[PDB]
Design a protein around this ligand. Structure first.
Ligand SMILES: *[C@@H]1O[C@H](CO)[C@@H](O)[C@H](O)[C@H]1NC(C)=O
Ligand SMILES: *[C@@H]1O[C@H](CO)[C@@H](O)[C@H](O)[C@H]1NC(C)=O
Ligand SMILES: *[C@@H]1O[C@H](CO)[C@@H](O)[C@H](O)[C@H]1NC(C)=O
Ligand SMILES: *[C@@H]1O[C@H](CO)[C@@H](O)[C@H](O)[C@H]1NC(C)=O
Ligand SMILES: *[C@@H]1O[C@H](CO)[C@@H](O)[C@H](O)[C@H]1NC(C)=O
Ligand SMILES: *[C@@H]1O[C@H](CO)[C@@H](O)[C@H](O)[C@H]1NC(C)=O
Lengths: 289, 228, 97
């Protein structure tokens, strides 16, 4: 009770006649609201995995992302989803991380050979065709779609590479037509015995197994270069309440205070207004403006 | 030739609303009563981009159509190219090799390489135009103001238009011109082609303390330089 | 702890958990390990439909680099307030003056 608190603030069991400042009343906030602008520039990964055309193993493309807002939570609506072993980063916390630029690697991989593309692995296409670094940040998107992209007359248009003598370092390509050198042999220029030219092709069939199936492998990669980040992930939910002591957070600027309608005419480039002696007076809504 | 800039070069440094208070800002502004370089369009040399350039132009036929930025004109390092048009602007930082003279709109003077960034927005463009370019914190800022009309005595605050997240090293810059029916070669002479009679201005920013007077509606009505 | 605990084709008895529903308060432990998910779909989704088993087996070999060799770490918890204490060094006493 305020009598014994007055005995508490002066450290004496008996108080005399007079007015005493004991404490300071302060209203605790009830709710907390965060707001962010609209998802205008949505990310065009719909060109990547929802497309029908795809590249080969050695002829993979690299499609970069400059400025977008991301959305990976809606990407899980696909039915052949079965592999998402992410590398370094948990898939839950990636939605809040904001990076600089995103590169995608789109190709098709033999479904028995999908375990070779992993950090700390050795295999056929891993050491000779395509490898990821051990400091890689990203995941693999692999799914089977043999019901749509194949026919019984032979879907051997997707080509691949089995072997070569050297080892390709990652982040380059080769469309080089190089002759096999076994030993004491000159180059002829035409195919034949011990001139094993590596132009190969797979054996895509619609009924070709359940584990030896075409897995459309998309390896999406995230890069940082100690720069100001451009590619932002899916933002938090936006909710708004007025005339109540709530926590406000409009692109930062976290605090406690009520929100009331104003009457002034602000300039369009202003984002948050500051009163005298460095106190925030007014912040405009990033959604409804 | 030279011209003294009387009260120009004042922009919004903090993008906040302040109603009828005076703010002492310590940033980079053009000092008052300082000289700027004056040019006449009726060939341009390269000018250094030290730590920020205030650009000014009074035109009546829209003959300048952008700028070129970058620490080098060669294709070894990433340069910047901003060209304006009648409908839109394209901001393009991707390190193309440029000629010894800028192009006159032959609608191409650039080659191919690793290309990185591209930007579409609203069009940036007697008619007076002012522009300020800054790169201190790795963010490209342009403050502009178009007032109908040497340089006038009227005060005018310059509002921020765009803010790019590119942080390219900039050391040199170069202006753009445009002329009717102009063909260009990799090897250019000093003759050129005829255009409208106009002029443009180039200033330089220095770190100065400025006390900006804000109005009731958040507009800057007057400014006072400390070391003047 | 490379010569003692790291095994070839084994060393799977030590477990580690990849996620948790909330940040655990300090000096606490948990033994039960039911499968947790995103909430709107049931458990046993270890195939990859947005569900993970928390306790994963590492099973690494000594061919790896120094960043992921198993380090047998032991933390000592102390409280240095004024209280009746009976655990300190072998420093002898001196008769009372
Ligand atoms: C991309 O695929 C997903 C999964 O089926 C689908 O929900 C989405 O609508 C597709 N996007 C398109 C067709 O633009
Ligand atoms: C965001 O979306 C809402 C609803 O579509 C709209 O009313 C509002 O004007 C939008 N804001 C911006 C800045 O586009
Ligand atoms: C092209 O630019 C990118 C990023 O600026 C760089 O990683 C790449 O090496 C460049 N290519 C060259 C210089 O051939
Ligand atoms: C930027 O350019 C200047 C002048 O050419 C040079 O002194 C400086 O080292 C450059 N900085 C970087 C990061 O390249
Ligand atoms: C501020 O704006 C209001 C609304 O347009 C206007 O009535 C008033 O005159 C302006 N005040 C000044 C000092 O410009
Ligand atoms: C007690 O158990 C609850 C429920 O599992 C848990 O949240 C809490 O952290 C535990 N506290 C301690 C001290 O172990």
């Amino acid at each position: 009770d305020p009598l014994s608190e007055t005995k508490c603030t002066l450290k004496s069991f008996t108080v005399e006649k007079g007015i005493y400042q004991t404490s300071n009343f302060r209203v605790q906030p009830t709710e907390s609201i965060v707001r962010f602008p609209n998802i205008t520039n949505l990310c065009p990964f719909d060109e990547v995995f929802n497309a029908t055309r795809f590249a080969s193993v050695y002829a993979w493309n690299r499609k970069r992302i400059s400025n977008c807002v991301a959305d990976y939570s809606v990407l899980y609506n696909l039915a052949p989803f079965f592999t998402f072993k992410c590398y370094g980063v948990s898939p839950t916390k990636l939605n809040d991380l904001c990076f600089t630029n995103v590169y995608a690697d789109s190709f098709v991989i033999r479904g028995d050979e999908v375990r070779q593309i992993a950090p700390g692995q050795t295999g056929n296409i891993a050491d000779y065709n395509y490898k990821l670094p051990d400091d890689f940040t990203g995941c693999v998107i692999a799914w089977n779609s043999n019901k749509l992209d194949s026919k019984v007359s032979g879907n051997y248009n997707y080509l691949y590479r089995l072997f070569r003598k050297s080892n390709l370092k990652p982040f380059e390509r080769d469309i080089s037509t190089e002759i096999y050198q076994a030993g004491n042999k000159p180059c002829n220029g035409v195919a034949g015995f011990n001139c094993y030219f590596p132009l190969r092709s797979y054996s895509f069939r619609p009924t070709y197994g359940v584990g030896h199936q075409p897995y459309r492998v998309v390896v999406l990669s995230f890069e940082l270069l100690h720069a100001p980040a451009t590619v932002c992930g899916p933002k938090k939910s936006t909710n708004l309440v007025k005339n109540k002591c709530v926590n406000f957070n409009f692109n930062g600027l976290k605090g406690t205070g009520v929100l009331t309608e104003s009457n002034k005419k602000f300039l369009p480039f202003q984002q948050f207004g500051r009163d005298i002696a460095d106190t925030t007076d007014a912040v405009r809504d990033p959604q409804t403006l | 030739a030279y011209t003294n800039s009387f009260t120009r070069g004042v922009y919004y440094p903090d993008k906040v609303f302040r109603s009828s208070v005076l703010h002492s800002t310590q940033d980079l502004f053009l000092p008052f009563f300082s000289n700027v370089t004056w040019f006449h369009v009726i060939d341009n040399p390269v000018l250094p981009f030290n730590d920020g350039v205030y650009f000014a132009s009074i035109e009546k036929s829209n003959i300048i159509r952008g700028w070129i930025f970058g620490t080098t004109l060669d294709s070894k390092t990433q340069s910047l190219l901003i060209v304006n048009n009648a409908t839109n602007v394209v901001i393009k930082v991707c390190e193309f090799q440029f000629c010894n003279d800028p192009f006159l709109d032959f609608r191409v003077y650039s080659s191919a390489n690793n290309c990185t960034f591209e930007y579409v927005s609203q069009p940036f463009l007697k008619n007076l135009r002012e522009f300020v370019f800054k790169n201190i914190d790795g963010y490209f800022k342009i403050y502009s103001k178009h007032t109908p009309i040497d340089l006038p005595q009227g005060f005018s605050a310059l509002e921020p238009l765009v803010d790019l997240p590119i942080g390219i090293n900039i050391t040199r810059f170069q202006t753009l011109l445009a002329l009717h029916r102009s063909y260009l070669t990799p090897g250019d002479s000093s003759s050129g082609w005829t255009a409208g009679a106009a002029a443009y201005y180039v200033g330089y920013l220095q770190p100065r303390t400025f006390l900006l007077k804000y109005n009731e509606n958040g507009t800057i009505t007057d400014a006072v330089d400390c070391a003047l």
